[PDB]
Amino acid sequence: AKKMIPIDDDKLIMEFKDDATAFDGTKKARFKGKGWLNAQLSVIFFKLLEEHGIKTHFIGVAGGNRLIVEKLDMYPLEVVVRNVVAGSLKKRLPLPEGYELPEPIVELYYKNDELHDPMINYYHAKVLGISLDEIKKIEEIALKVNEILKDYLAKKGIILVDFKLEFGKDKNGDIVLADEISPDTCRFWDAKTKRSLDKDVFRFDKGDLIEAYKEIYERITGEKPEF
Amino acid sequence: AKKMIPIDDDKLIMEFKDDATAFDGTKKARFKGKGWLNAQLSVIFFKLLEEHGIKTHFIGVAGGNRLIVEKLDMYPLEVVVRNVVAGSLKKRLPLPEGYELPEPIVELYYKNDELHDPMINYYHAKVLGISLDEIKKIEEIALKVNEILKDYLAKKGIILVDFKLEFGKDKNGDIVLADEISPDTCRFWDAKTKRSLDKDVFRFDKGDLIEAYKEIYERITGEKPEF
């Protein structure tokens, strides 16, 4: 879905591709224009978060589907924030899809292909070299990001169901939001109909992925995508 | 492995059986005298913890393989403390069996047969009705229990690799250690040889289960079991 291209010690290129993968690599397809949409939406979200005082790796656009991003010492984590029950949570808590959580859930996943990205807690993280203070800072950022995105999206008739973040550390030792923010990494439901406007359309053949991602883009920007 | 028999609102009978189960019920066998050993060892450990100020459900012995225990509102948790890498941890962190942890790991598991007892974090626990203060108290108790047991066992040439606890709440709202403490619920390794003196002998056919459990009993008591 994405390619990283080194420029120097300070920055690199993050390039969004049209490739889509699901179910641990077993499902694959290419969607023309997906890269452009995910790149554009990431930029929109990064800029919004920066305005709200969230440090992100976003530096600038490099034309096409390319972003210039800050080089970081990456944490081997995927940080998932969940507002509504969906996806893997249904296999952890006996709650139905669509269940409204009384407060957000934050889950930490250890990025490790061989172990298939298992969930971890604060004690496992410490063994991996991540201090409890770092973990607390990471979850604090993720929860603030959640508030900003959910509020922003709700005013555009979209329910932020859940989303996945990655983080790294900059040269000052500050924790910086990295990776992407897109319909690939978030669950987005229409507020009126509850239908998926995200990667679940591809995961479960709910319709046309490109049309769903365009709809998100159009609702957010107020204009049709130019590509 | 165990049966619970209600007496009244204050207490019940916890009875230890000779049955052994492994790998989610797929492996079964009966070991003559296992119930007696697990009952006796639980009593020994409960008494030791009580002397060190740990609240446990232990009230008294009711002859044979029967303990009288306090009735509690049980938490739907299994709390696992790990000092040495073994078992399921090898599938979560890329560390070898026998790896010495820099500090103990505490894992919370949601007791739910349908979901196969998935691991959970503090956020999932809150959704299940368990406050962060309760979770903190539970882990504090578990970590203290760990120190007491590991110190006690090391002076008898046994390495406490890991163990599993359950807890409930008494009528005063205090958090009380429940279930059992035995070679069924702990990993015990000989300090000299590193060989299993616990349920792993049954799990992986490492030898005679009864002989292993007797050895633990003999090392702890200083005398051969009478049954």
Swiss-Prot record, chains A, B:
The keyword Amino-acid biosynthesis does not apply. One of its GO terms (biological process) is 'de novo' IMP biosynthetic process. One of its GO terms (molecular function) is phosphoribosylaminoimidazolesuccinocarboxamide synthase activity. It is an enzyme of class 6 (ligase). The keyword Nuclease does not apply. Transmembrane segments: none annotated. Pathway: Purine metabolism; IMP biosynthesis via de novo pathway; 5-amino-1-(5-phospho-D-ribosyl)imidazole-4-carboxamide from 5-amino-1-(5-phospho-D-ribosyl)imidazole-4-carboxylate: step 1/2. This is Phosphoribosylaminoimidazole-succinocarboxamide synthase. It comes from Pyrococcus horikoshii (strain ATCC 700860 / DSM 12428 / JCM 9974 / NBRC 100139 / OT-3). The gene is purC.
